[PDB]
Amino acid sequence: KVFCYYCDREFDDEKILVQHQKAKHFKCHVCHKKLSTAGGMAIHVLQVHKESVTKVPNAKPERESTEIEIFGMQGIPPDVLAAHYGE
Ligand SMILES: [Zn+2]
Ligand SMILES: [Zn+2]
């Protein structure tokens, strides 16, 4: 259907994808608040808990940067779409 930039898992639709992203990638490890982006998560952890997060949780090592803004399928670089749908 669609796939997650961070982990390459497939989902039947974007709504399900967004919930998975919030749960597995944008969740604060200390309090479990679900933020809306990986950047948002890292800023939360820092500001609330004073901890530095530089890797997205549960992500492939090449996808682990907090700096790219991914919302469901929105923001995925065209190269990564390519690599996923063949390779
Ligand atoms: Zn994922
Ligand atoms: Zn928290």
Author numbering: 10 to 96
List passages from the publication reporting this PDB structure.
OsSUF4 encodes a C2H2-type zinc finger transcription factor. OsSUF4 comprises two conserved C2H2-type zinc finger domains at the N-terminus and a large proline-rich domain at the C-terminus. OsSUF4 physically interacts with SDG725 and recognizes a 7-bp DNA element within the promoter regions of the rice florigen genes RICE FLOWERING LOCUS T1 (RFT1) and Heading date 3a (Hd3a) to promote rice flowering. The C-terminal domain of OsSUF4 interacts with SDG725 and the N-terminal zinc finger domain of OsSUF4 is responsible for DNA binding.
To unravel the structural basis underlying target DNA recognition by OsSUF4, we carried out a crystallographic study of the zinc finger domain (aa 10–100) of OsSUF4. The structure was solved by a Se-SAD phasing method and refined up to 1.95 Å resolution. The OsSUF4 zinc finger domain contained two C2H2 type zinc finger motifs with different folding. In many known C2H2-type zinc finger proteins, neighboring C2H2 motifs are connected by long and flexible loops; however, only two residues were shown to be embedded in the junction region of the two zinc finger motifs of OsSUF4, preventing them from synchronously nestling into the DNA major groove. Notably, the first zinc finger domain is enriched with positively charged residues (R18, K24, K31, K33, K36, and K43), forming an electropositive interface. Compared with wild-type OsSUF4, Hd3a promoter activation by all single mutant proteins was significantly reduced; a more dramatic reduction was observed for the R18A/K33A/K36A/K43A mutant. Taken together, our findings suggested that the positive residues within the surface of the first zinc finger motif are essential for target DNA binding by OsSUF4.
